[PDB]
Amino acid sequence: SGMERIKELMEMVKNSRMREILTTTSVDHMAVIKKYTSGRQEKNPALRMKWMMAMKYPISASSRIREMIPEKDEDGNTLWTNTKDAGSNRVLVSPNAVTWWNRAGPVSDVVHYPRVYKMYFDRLERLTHGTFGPVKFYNQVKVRKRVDINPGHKDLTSREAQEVIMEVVFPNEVGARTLSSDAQLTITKEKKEELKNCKISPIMVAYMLERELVRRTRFLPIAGATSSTYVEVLHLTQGTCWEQQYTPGGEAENDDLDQTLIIASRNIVRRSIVAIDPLASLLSMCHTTSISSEPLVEILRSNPTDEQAVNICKAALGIRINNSFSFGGYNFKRVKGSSQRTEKAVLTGNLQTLTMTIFEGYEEFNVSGKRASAVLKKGAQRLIQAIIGGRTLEDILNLMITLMVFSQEEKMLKAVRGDLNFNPMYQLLRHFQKDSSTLLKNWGTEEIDPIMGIAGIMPDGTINKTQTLMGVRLSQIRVNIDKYLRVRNEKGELLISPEEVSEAQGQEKLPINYNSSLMWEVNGPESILTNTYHWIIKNWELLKTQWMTDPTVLYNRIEFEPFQTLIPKGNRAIYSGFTRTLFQQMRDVEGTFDSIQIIKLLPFSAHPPSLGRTQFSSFTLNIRGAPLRLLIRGNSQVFNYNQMENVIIVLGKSVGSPERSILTESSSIESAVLRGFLILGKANSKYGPVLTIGELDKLGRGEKANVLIGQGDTVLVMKRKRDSS
Amino acid sequence: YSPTSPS
């Protein structure tokens, strides 16, 4: 009706105190007087509540409570009083009033409340339909990272979300702006439909929608899956020393599945290369591995992701590579190279930025359709060459335009005039498909040799034998994979190399379980370091006698293969040479023996060594993108023998205690540090000035010198006479 | 489990 509201207003406007305020203070100023209070924010609410709960009437409530519940309950407890709460018309009330309501108050209808509180009830839905696996115990590596904390956020900005909320709950009071996107329209109609006729405060509906719609993030330490539904249950899935395997209810998003598939395939390919039979190792891991508790092989059979490592996994399983797609009406099939994808935004000739998914790398397509074919050679925003043919000049030219847009050249972008308004690749296409006059003048022309069968095409539309639009010429797949994972065509030419796979290490969105003997328990490179150095300490006495007696069997242990993926390919050989040479010096120079140095450098053995005689103050290891450096002399971030604990600390994680023998184990001479040299002790100026490691080749055999060996230390060094095996 | 001490 709106009859009781205007009646109450006149009744208030009768009061001169109220009419004073209602006229003088503006709509802007009403925000100030609404929050005008004598009440301080409480500094010790914990204390005050313990103090106040001892009192008879600590709760304040609306005075209408006196008409709704009785003054006394059945047992004689006073439920409400008439004492007004300071600064309001509310009255002081007992906790027994809350209990009375809950057991004998008015019942209302609340069956649609789960729709209003959807953000909460979806958490219970996920947990109720969640599945638990086993608990594994291991050093749990946690990367502090910004992640989503609002699973099922329909992704919108705060301003966009405000318009949606206003439309739904306060439909009459919306401002000038309207529902701009179809995201906003579908969400508004759905919310209006779901929340229709639900007796609840509109303030609460507006609140829950605000929390539901707008994306929110936090920096959190995360081991494993980073997806929102996994982030939600970090307390349950990870501790300091344990992983509780768990799959939330509901289906994983394809975005997350594609991201994790790529990571899994790369890790599989990286592991396989360092094994003796890479193709068999890859095949073994593919059959054992699962992503989000789904086997990797059935994912590969139905997932259309195009990526070098994934394609190698598909090749090994004999399943077709997503080698092709269709654009502008024509089917593009890639015959050479690969698509590295970089999402950026570029300025046109109109001075208008656009979010493109620009492609890098040398690529080569066979293109066909609409009575016209072409061989395209393309670089990063570069049409290298297009040899186009077709039944009509109209048709050849149509394909030329499509190719000139598909190139993504700066020529064609800067030749755009006016605004693009009809995905943004098709927005450039439909523009140039209805006017290409500036495109062709701005494209530019080149001279060519007159070859028989080939002709050029000018901007005007004529055919010219020795001139043509830049890069354009006019004229009229079974796959195999070998032992070493090289993917070739029927002609025997390289399509995909394992070596040319992307080195990028991102963290999985969904959980990956390889279930392989070739892999360690946990996913990731920090785990590889810890499990490797843990294994060496655990089986030390076995490996120590295997070091003395039969060293080539020790170096070729397959437990060192995961560690080898962390070493750069080029360095593996020389590091093994340097390592093996340094170990045999400890064997040759009798008396000296450093077990910590053996344990530190032992995993760098596992590769056929090179005979090159270069020097190293550190071996490099690729860990989550950044190179880290394991120092040859003493402790570093990667390897840290801490004598106080008698523990080897690998990237901040205790890896085990070595034998207490090793605490009391030293010698003047240090044998396993420099190739063909021995460290004797402290620096002595008697033996010349200080040198670097690169300057050591000048010393004669037997001659001694001072060296800046590492970490600010300066050291005396002799060149030993005989070399080692 | 019943805890014990040398005492």
């Binding site: 006149m10 203070t25 009403m30 010790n44 309001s88 309501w101 920096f219 501790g239 | -």
Partner: protein, 750 residues
């Protein structure tokens, strides 16, 4: 055997067993009585560190103002405040070079803010000093009080609604030399009663004009009080509260400094705990990558002594002007206001002191204003000396305090000064045998120094240390220390080749928050949850933390389980509910029901967790939207509590609005004072705002904008709502005339 817990450190590293050194299960220190002793201590010490500077009497206030900047260079390691303007500007220029376009976009974002910001925005935040009453008051009342007195005199630019116009009114108000303020005072009336005549306390108001000094002194006044509950310190210290005049300017300056700090790797502010750790992890990563295998690394676990007392308002004016270089001069001058008011700031000296006579057995209070003229026979030797030194600075009750700062005045711009010294340490600027990087948040810093030999580190430290002295920063030699990089401490985070847990820091957050039954259950379970994630709270202890919280919650709210033999004021009514209820599992803990929580479901709100298992009638009562217990607040302040770890932030929680979402009774001490009328103002303002929301429902979600009147806006809506409800709807023809007659009747009453 004598038991000694410290001997655990023989086996267990100190970082790994650091929880044993944090005694945070006992009551922290509280100040009893006045903080005037501490406020004078601070004011005296502030001037001692700047004592070689240049004294000058102020033209407008007559306050004796010490200026130490560009003063004599220090000749000892004692706390100095002789910051050199040119050295500051070099560091701020260095910061500009190293981050091209930062100052530009920082200013550009702060420009957009100033345009868009409304006067509303100062209703938010902590208590401000009110010049109207010479006391602390809530932000919004101090705002409304200043607007009222400004409106009563010749100042109404803020009637627009935008904040910059309110800021104009503040600068224009200094020109008035007869500023009028209504005070209040008690009056003892006598009235008959039925047939005896009893005395009656009542309150009436009286107008008072103020001098040009009086008003100006009060607008430059910052309140003082002792900081309570502060851990890790034998002695108490003084803290300060800004006034209403300076606050809106401070907002925009801190906003600039925030936008700067947001894009500086070396700033700890304003990011949270985990991101501070990530930032520290990055500089260690970056320092190790850019060094050679020949080089060394040492880390200073760092503390700056006397941080606020030696940071000068004049230096802050240099920074602000250099950061804003090439921007519009109105924007430079606007942001320059706050540092200027800080340079001419005066401090209220507090409650005063209490005297006692043993032989007579009496006590008496004297104000801090009386410290100027009072006889010194009363005081002890130390207090007497402090009063004699403070008398030289004293100006109409307050004490002048030009140099330095005080705690709780100003935030992030001091970190920018520190970060600029960290930025000086790049290889490409220093070009020495040493170089540095690190992180800073206020007085605390972690500095990493790399060099070729240990002698280079020493030279690096001295260069850092002495450069810091040149901008009024004093590294503590007592509390800072150095070691090889690998372990350090930073704001009670402990790094040992990686950050380790400091769970005992969080121990005071394990308990019953005291908001209400709904919020506390959500808060409590979430404290357990967030500590499992962030501070290595293991699963067994976390289960036990649930158990103990439920015990504490049940006892505190007297809501023991419905089948208990206990006896409280609530046991009988809870028993009635228990026996009446079919599905007991669905009863909330506050209604005598069982605890549902374990590790797996801490993130699920209680009502949500028990919803399937509730009796229909109980659930329908519990979540009844017509219940008289809830305070229907704004959306922006829905499901917010307040917490103290930082200053004093808000904690959002997840809960369904129920009869348990109640609010405890307000404090009633105001009823005995002269400010008693403020309660009635509030009651009247609330009924006015309540009725407006019946015409503008969306005002509870989005603050409505309008220079028009509150009554006139309601009247416009009253007519047109009646129109569409009849024209095409379910309202009769007779009722449209009935509504518009009332609107015309209201329009007649004005």
């Amino acid at each position: 055997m004598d038991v000694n817990p410290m001997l655990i450190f023989l086996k267990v590293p100190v970082q790994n067993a650091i929880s044993t050194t944090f005694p945070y299960t006992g009551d922290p220190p509280y100040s009893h009585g006045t903080g005037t002793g501490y406020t004078m201590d601070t004011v005296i010490r502030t001037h001692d560190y700047s004592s070689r500077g240049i004294w000058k009497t102020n033209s407008e206030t007559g306050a004796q103002q010490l200026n130490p900047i560009d003063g004599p260079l220090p000749e000892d390691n004692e706390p100095s405040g002789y910051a050199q303007t040119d050295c500051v500007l070099e560091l701020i220029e260095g910061l500009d070079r190293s981050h091209p376009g930062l100052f530009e976009t920082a200013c550009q974002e702060t420009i957009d803010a100033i345009q868009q910001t409304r006067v509303d925005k100062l209703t938010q935040g902590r208590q401000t000093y009110d010049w109207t009453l010479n006391r602390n008051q809530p932000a919004a009342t101090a705002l409304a009080n200043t607007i009222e007195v400004f409106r009563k005199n010749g100042y109404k630019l803020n009637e627009s609604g935008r904040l910059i116009d309110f800021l104009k009114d503040v600068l224009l108000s200094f020109e008035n030399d007869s500023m009028e303020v209504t005070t209040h005072f008690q009056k003892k009336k006598r009235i008959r009663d039925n047939k005896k005549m009893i005395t009656q306390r009542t309150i009436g108001k009286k107008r008072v004009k103020l001098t040009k000094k009086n008003y100006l002194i009060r607008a430059l006044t910052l309140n003082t009080m002792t900081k309570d509950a502060e851990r890790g310190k034998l002695k108490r210290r003084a803290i300060a509260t800004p006034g209403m005049q300076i606050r809106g300017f401070v907002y925009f300056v801190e906003l600039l400094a925030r936008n700067i700090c947001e894009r500086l790797e070396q700033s700890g502010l304003p990011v949270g705990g985990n991101e501070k750790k990530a930032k520290l992890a990055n500089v260690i990563k970056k320092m190790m990558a850019k060094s050679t295998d020949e080089e060394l690394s040492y880390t200073i676990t760092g503390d700056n002594t006397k941080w606020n007392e030696n940071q000068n308002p004049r230096i802050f004016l240099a920074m602000v002007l250099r950061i804003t270089a090439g921007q519009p001069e109105w924007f430079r001058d606007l942001l320059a206001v706050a540092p200027i008011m800080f340079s001419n700031k005066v401090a209220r000296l507090g409650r005063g002191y209490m005297f006692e006579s043993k032989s007579m057995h009496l006590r008496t209070q004297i104000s801090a204003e009386n410290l100027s003229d009072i006889n010194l026979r009363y005081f002890n030797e130390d207090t007497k000396k402090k009063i004699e030194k403070i008398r030289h600075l004293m100006v109409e009750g307050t004490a002048s305090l030009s140099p330095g700062m005080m705690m709780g005045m100003f935030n992030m711009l001091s970190t920018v000064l520190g970060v600029s010294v960290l930025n000086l340490g790049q290889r490409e600027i220093l070009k020495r045998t040493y170089w540095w990087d690190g992180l800073q948040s206020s007085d605390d810093f972690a500095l990493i120094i790399n060099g070729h030999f240990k002698e280079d580190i020493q030279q690096g430290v001295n260069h850092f240390y002495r450069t810091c002295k040149l901008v009024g920063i004093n590294m503590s030699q007592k509390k800072s220390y150095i070691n090889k990089t690998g372990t350090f401490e930073f704001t009670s985070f402990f790094y040992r080749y990686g950050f380790v847990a400091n769970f005992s820091m969080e121990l005071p957050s394990f308990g019953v928050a005291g908001n209400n039954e709904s919020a506390d259950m959500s808060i409590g379970t979430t404290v357990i949850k967030t500590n499992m994630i962030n501070n290595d709270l293991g699963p067994a202890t976390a289960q036990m933390a649930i158990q103990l919280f439920i015990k504490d919650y049940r006892y505190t709210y007297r809501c023991h389980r419905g089948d208990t033999n206990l006896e409280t004021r609530r046991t009988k009514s809870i028993k009635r509910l228990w026996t009446e209820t079919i599905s007991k599992a669905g009863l909330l803990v506050a209604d005598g029901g069982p605890n549902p929580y374990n590790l797996r479901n801490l993130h699920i709100p209680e009502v949500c967790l028990k919803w399937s298992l509730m009796d229909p009638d109980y659930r329908g009562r519990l979540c009844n939207p017509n219940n008289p217990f809830v305070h229907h607040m704004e959306v922006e302040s829905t499901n917010l509590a307040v917490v103290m770890p930082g200053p004093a932030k808000s904690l959002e929680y997840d809960a369904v609005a129920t009869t348990h979402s109640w609010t405890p009774k307000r404090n009633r001490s105001i009823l005995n004072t002269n400010q008693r009328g403020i309660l009635e103002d509030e009651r009247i303002y609330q009924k006015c705002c309540q009725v407006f929301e019946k015409f503008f429902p969306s005002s509870t979600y989005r603050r409505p904008i309008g220079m028009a009147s509150m009554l006139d806006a309601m009247l416009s809506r009253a007519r047109i709502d009646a129109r569409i409800d009849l024209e095409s709807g379910r309202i009769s023809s007779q009722d449209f005339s009935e509504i518009t007659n009332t609107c015309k009747a209201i329009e007649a009453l004005k």
